[PDB]
Amino acid sequence: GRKKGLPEFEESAPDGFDPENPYKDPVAMVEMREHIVREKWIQIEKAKILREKVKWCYRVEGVNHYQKCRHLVQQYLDSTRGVGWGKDHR
Amino acid sequence: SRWATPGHEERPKGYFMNRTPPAPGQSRKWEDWELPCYITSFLTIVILGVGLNAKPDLSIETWAHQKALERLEMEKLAT
């Protein structure tokens, strides 16, 4: 049985993983892989939230979008460089 | 005249799924596979349509979206 609510995970990276030798604590290695996957999804969800800002600034500001969206566009494009598992490594 | 004079097809051409109609007043006899398959189809519709909309949303996207909001909040309000 499962309790009602959103899934809960540890905020922190597992204590027991050595980046030098990752095949030394197998349990910690698996936990670190899952933690990294979760962290990567948090960055994807951040870039998606920043995209909603651009979408709406374009729509709201019309022909003034170039000067009004500039900071939002910069933020979105910075978050998209090295996001998820696309064309950028880390 | 095509709009004021009714059509001539008292009954349509062909038979749906090429089965001849039953004798007047009678009912079509169901083949052996019909009831099990129809009950399976109904149960499939019910199970998917209820359980899929009733199971908790545990997708990684949904969990990360709530996590992303609170981190943008914690970093925006603070400096």
Binding site: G1 | A54, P56
Partner: peptide, 15 residues
């Protein structure tokens, strides 16, 4: 009572 609240609880039970 409500179908869905029962369905929520039943699914949670099965998990």
């Amino acid at each position: 009572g409500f179908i869905m609240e029962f369905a929520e609880n039943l699914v949670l039970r099965l998990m």
